[PDB]
Amino acid sequence: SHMCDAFVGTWKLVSSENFDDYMKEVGVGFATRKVAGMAKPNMIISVNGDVITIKSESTFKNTEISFILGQEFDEVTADDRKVKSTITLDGGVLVHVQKWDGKSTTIKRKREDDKLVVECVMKGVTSTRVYERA
Ligand SMILES: CCn1c(S)nnc1CNc1ccccc1Cl
């Protein structure tokens, strides 16, 4: 109970850095990178008991995951990878690992001031995406 309270709400993307290079490193193709890089998603996070739901709504795609911390699940990502995901809380940071085709990427979500900061890492490449309350 109360684990992710500071994450809950409706959030709007306000800045992005290095996302094209992150997407390249993940293997996303040209057209998807261009269209996806234009999107300004809203991220809606909610908690009901032990189940966390993260929805992303954008002009590119609407996605939704629900999960229990530490419990692996199947995810189809916005760029159409079929991945196996596990999300844990590490020192107040939501840590989301995706595995597919022998590859791995980690997405960290943390509260910093009034922002929700999303750090996406693939090998040596990091993208930082900043959300504010909608
Ligand atoms: C990385 C998390 N994320 C944030 S933050 N905004 N959208 C996403 C979903 N990922 C994604 C979206 C489009 C193309 C490629 C990818 Cl990997």
From Swiss-Prot:
One of its GO terms (molecular function) is long-chain fatty acid transmembrane transporter activity. GO terms for biological process: brown fat cell differentiation; cellular response to lithium ion; cellular response to tumor necrosis factor; cholesterol homeostasis; fatty acid transport; long-chain fatty acid transport; negative regulation of DNA-templated transcription; positive regulation of cold-induced thermogenesis. A fatty acid binds at R129, V130, Y131. GO terms for cellular component: cytoplasm; cytosol; extracellular exosome; lipid droplet; nucleus. The modification Phosphoserine is found at S15. Belongs to the calycin superfamily. Fatty-acid binding protein (FABP) family. Monomer. Homodimer. Interacts with PPARG. This is Fatty acid-binding protein, adipocyte. The lineage of its organism: Eukaryota, Metazoa, Chordata, Craniata, Vertebrata. The gene is FABP4.
